[PDB]
Symmetry: T
Subunit: 167 residues, 12 copies
């Protein structure tokens, strides 16, 4: 069996096409990718540069967040590839993210909790914004977005509880 045998039977990538995402779908995932990638960069920045009370817990929880964002970035980027899109998470493209910035300096732990919670909440904000039209077109892509939302919001609660009083 040769490439010719296969082509005449019509069992080829060109004859049997898959789901091809709309440029809207592809663009919504792209936004999520940028924000997830900025998140793990800023996350690591904070990881190294935190100082002050309850240092270790925060150092470790920032690594957990970094790990999740890295994994989710790969998942979204590859979801794009699977649906015909082309991801971009080069540093210059990622720099245009609006999730926030922890700065170049050492950061008090208490202050870092607030900044990171905001950065995570901004990344979730993007997913929730793009979710409905993605779900409408491709429910399976929205399912991936559901996993990312659950995990980020879980971590947002865990990290932020450090700075809360009872209600």
């Amino acid at each position: 069996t040769t490439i010719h045998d296969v082509q005449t039977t019509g069992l080829t990538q060109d004859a049997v096409t898959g789901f091809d995402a709309s440029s809207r779908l592809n663009a919504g995932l792209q936004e999520v990718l940028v924000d997830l990638t900025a998140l793990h960069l800023q996350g690591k920045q904070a990881h190294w540069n935190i100082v002050g009370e309850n240092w270790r817990d925060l150092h470790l929880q920032l690594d957990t967040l970094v790990e999740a964002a890295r994994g989710f970035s790969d998942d979204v980027a590859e979801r794009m590839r699977a649906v015909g899109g082309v991801p971009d998470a080069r540093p210059q493209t990622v720099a245009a993210s609006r999730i926030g910035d922890v700065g170049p300096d050492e950061i008090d732990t208490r202050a870092c909790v607030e900044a990171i919670v905001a950065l995570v909440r901004h990344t979730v904000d993007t997913i929730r914004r793009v979710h409905d039209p993605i779900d409408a077109e491709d429910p399976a892509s929205a399912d991936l977005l559901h996993a990312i939302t659950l995990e980020l919001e879980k971590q947002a609660w865990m990290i932020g509880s450090e700075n809360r009083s009872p209600r």
Copy 2:
């Protein structure tokens, strides 16, 4: 740098709020939590007290159910936390669950199969009832419920199969 620096930029928990669930959403997860917690308590009760035919399989399958329900309860409770809710699974609060009760005594294995299937189906009933309004409000929370539904119904099938005969076709 300091907490002064962060509040001037507005990168805080107060200045940037996360998704805050309606009391309806939180109330619907609280129901699921209560029943899942009751399910694993009853599960362990039965795990210890079953007697009779095909004992070991049921002993082990009950522990598998117990483990799933424990994990799912942590998941639902923490999902509530994540959306602004405040879970309650204290024993007195869980005792108000209406899923069913295996009793305090030694229980025949065949009888236990029937009871536990009903407990699982009741817990699933709660989930399927709270589902639509939760999904309309928070699709992510409903995805969690789908995972719970899939696993519980799988277990209800595996456990119940001990007592089944081939259906009339």
Copy 3:
């Protein structure tokens, strides 16, 4: 506690029925099962009989697809069990699948990439076709289909990429 004790409380499979899928739902899942099982049988055929450039990578990725399809078939079949359905994946039933065939002969690796991408896409087509009415009736069953969709479409990309050149922008 005897069987009798359990019946009089109404804690049984008979009194407390679970979700009972429509015959449409079950039929939809059965189509997906048939195509998934066809996929792993064809996958193994190819796994053995590929010859030519980048042999090892293809041999391995075909096993990864086989493993996924096998697991997903188990999941669908058991999902059917959980909802009242009776799956069939005997070889004569699976042979009616229309996803395609890799043939009885040694196959060139480049030819195999093309064919396997087609078999995978045909399997995904079935899922996408049965999806909406399944989702309407039972969102949990649709969540299983979503997991299957993500993984199959991921694999189709990875395998197919061997034969691709950058798109004309």
Copy 4:
């Protein structure tokens, strides 16, 4: 070899009986079970609902306690079965435990340390109370109680040290 062959040789559960615990033994273990079960329920309640300084450490240490109490509950319940007793840890039976309650609301971390230490110390109190007559009758059951005491008191120290000053 059939059930009849076995019965005539006298090798049966009915002919060769094991250690049968006194209703006192069985009742002392039952008290321990209730308290261990309440402990892991309240433990999880706190696990979810803590807020404030050193959140993560406490969240994790409450899971360690929950895990130990769950295991020990199964051990005691099954020890009862092995000695002829019949355990009950249904939610309504467990609700009658007097170990204490963390309440339905969010709880400050510092406050949670105090409440949990008390809940653990109350559970240990029950074991120490029932220990002597159990040991007298069935040393092996007391040995299980020794393992539970060591572990709970270890965790009681670990959790409470958070709120201590040097002596």
Copy 5:
């Protein structure tokens, strides 16, 4: 370079491997078909059993499925290593005569009987093709011994559910 390699005779063409006859290959193909049929029927039963001692049987069926799947892969690849070209496509595997558990819910005790028969028919094929295979290629036969040991073990374990002391 490839020409360097050709000049010293260190090639698949110059140094041929052991080549199986079409009978050796046919003997292994039969074994493959039956083993593949076995794991497909095994899974069918795994899903559809109902009744007494359900879980043990559910699990043991999966252990049989896993064994038959691995063995099928070993057999197909043995064929490949000796020049044969295996076929286990569904239509080809549907011609197996090991038996069929049907498409319906099946009583556990009935399933034990059927599956033991299916296993024993697969072992029958292996023992039938064995001697000509061992005469020609003793290493192929060693694989067959491994498959035989494991299948007959599982046949004993599964079938024991229905047995009385003799």
Copy 6:
């Protein structure tokens, strides 16, 4: 540092003797060793030769008992070594055990449950009989017996429960 250096400081096995068990203690542990070794040999016999309902669960649980008895025998024998005793678990010595025998024939699973529960209880009886004087002399040796008691009695319950019906309350 030579041997001589060690002798003159009195840092030797001869100068610094350990705990030396009484002949009663050693004899008590030897009885327990004999019964434990008999237990795992009989356990394996049964493991192979059981036939009938709930075969697999019993086959597996018998291996779990075998594993436990084997480990516990090693522990007792070595406990004896640690205290000056010399254990014997050769087959001719173990054959004098009075815990019972499962016979040379295929055994019905229900008959095997009964017999094995008896063998286990007879082994526990030996431990309980030798316990108090062992505890009086050497509480550490008694703590080993406690661990053995807990596990054997746990197993007797799990195995025996197959043949039990709820007790008359």
Copy 7:
């Protein structure tokens, strides 16, 4: 149902397995007795050795014990898979003639000699029963080859403690 299964002849009764002769079964029973005797004597020595290079011998004895235990289980179950009924109760195993390390503390160098003899006597039994077993059931014999390889390996490793270069 069970009647459904009976009508199509898919039963343990209708489809019989390979049945061993009473000689095959007797050959395996001998192997079982000796292997079981081996691990019991192995443990005895494991506890009671005293003297030079103690730890190595303590550990290697346990490795022998583990191997002989697993092999005993394989042999007993092979018997079961082919229709035999194994017996390894202590009184039955006490009739083994492989040898005995006695009930006393044993010098390590003496123990090496005794244990190697015990292993070699077990291997002797296997090689004696081999040819009639291989004639009748080549798969049974394949198990015997595995047992032989492992025991002779351990015999070499253990015995080497006492050897001089030749």
Copy 8:
């Protein structure tokens, strides 16, 4: 909710005290701690400095002893913490241990066996001496000591056996 709420209910460390050990109990564990800590320090000294016949076995067995003593020391120290005591295992404090000393030099393997057995037996001597009054006061603390006793005496046997001949019967 707040720390005000907790002190009004009395659920605190101050209002509900745990078991507080007598200075005698704490003093007896402190002795065990000092000696166990000395034992692993001397153990490592010997681990590095042994020379001669059957080197590797002893090297490895010394590390096993070191590991056990380290773990047991953490156990005893933390047990003290749990009962209100305050352990001290600083080097100067541990140097007052009377269990024995392996010296600073290369040590023949046979000689090392003799010394280490004596060190282990001395550490065990401390435990057996403090035992009865600890058990009378806190049976749980004595159970810990039983575990330590069992493992140390096992190791004293395994290590010492290198130098033993069959006893005179």
Copy 9:
């Protein structure tokens, strides 16, 4: 005991300083950090976007590179922290890296091999340039750089080998 007790003894971070690196040392590690971080970002870009011959091997090898560079970046950043420096690997700061850029589009596998080898070699160039003055000041920091150099150059070889022919001898 208290923080008063510790400051009178002088056992503090203020009273006993660790090695404080020169701004030159910190500046040299900062360069390495920026480039290692750029390397794994570009690595993932390529991981997703490669198309063409021997796809899977390159996909996987790029992930191995990504993993190494991530770990090494954590190592360098934390080394800076340890010597008094303050790392910066925010996206805008990393975007100033001059190692090279794989572009935003689908990239042929052969072309990707060439690009990534150059990116790796550029990152290595930075290390070898900062090395001598770092080693003169802090041999420990230079040892870290040796580990990075070894792994990166190994990967540059493995990745580049896809496109190589035997050299002219």
Copy 10:
């Protein structure tokens, strides 16, 4: 004591093991030399391959190296267990005639050809010495079957890179 053990005849001297002939030992020695040569050449190629589909070949060479190393150890130790004295010192292994990949960078496609030839020459040795080994010691031959299965598998996997459908 050792004298106690001597009085009951439980010694390596009194109870001898299976002893291989010098031909059995010579047959295994040849297999050892070739297997050792195989893993050394395998590593050489592992380092020095250049060109298309590099990584797959790099990895599969290592899998071949690992297999040949383990098999070499099994063969040498089998010799030891039956009284032989293996030799795999570099000078001795240099006499192997399986082939040589040279000391230079080697094109991947050329390497596939060479390595398959090297594997097939090793398998050739095993099949040549097989029948006299199996006649004398069937357990030794069982080891040979394992080695044969694995090497021929790897030969197929590696060589397939260069093959066309027939």
Copy 11:
């Protein structure tokens, strides 16, 4: 082949000698060993006796330090043996270490951070002092010292960050 055959071929420990360290090298490693051993003793002392805010993080990080120092002690001691030296880390020899002491009493967590950071920094001080002449004589021994320096200084930063404000 016998001991005699080997001796005549000259393949023996006595005929073919290895690297033999200078008493200076051996003495520099010995200093490092003492300090590493004191470090893990004091580390454990603190591990047990800490009380106060962020107890758990510090309890665990002190175990990580203890584990590293124990491993490194074994590495240095065995490096000495490999180069002809003879290590001594008996408690009385180790007591002469000047790294510092956490005392016999319970210790506030904040105070412990400062003391331990100082103890670690003092151990690193010793390694840096002895490093240059060791590196000159035996680069491989200095390489081991590089691994120990990197790890101790890493932990020194991690532990001390607890008590820092941003700069």
Copy 12:
């Protein structure tokens, strides 16, 4: 992105060359490779053919040395690849090693300890001889040699210690 795109940016192996070792460096690493490969071949010979006292410990430690030498050979050879060199470890090349030979015969364990310590020391001698010029040119390559030195010298001590008695102080 095509190959062409990559060439015009100068992102290739040709435009961006890596570190290229001198022929001296490569020759130095080649000597180390030859001796390491000789070491593991001789190690295996000995592993099989040792007879006599403390057999098992020596058998095992020889495998540990073999494993180390095998891994280190791979590291050196690939280090050579990473820097432009072409390693050779074919048997005829390795046979020119001068580290020593254990012979074709059974060897007494005490004789083997002596010989293997010599082979290991000869291998270390090669490394130490080639070290300084390698370090001068490429400190990263020297760091690999340091790791090899530490482990080989560790092993020589452990193996050799079997035959040592305490030194005359």
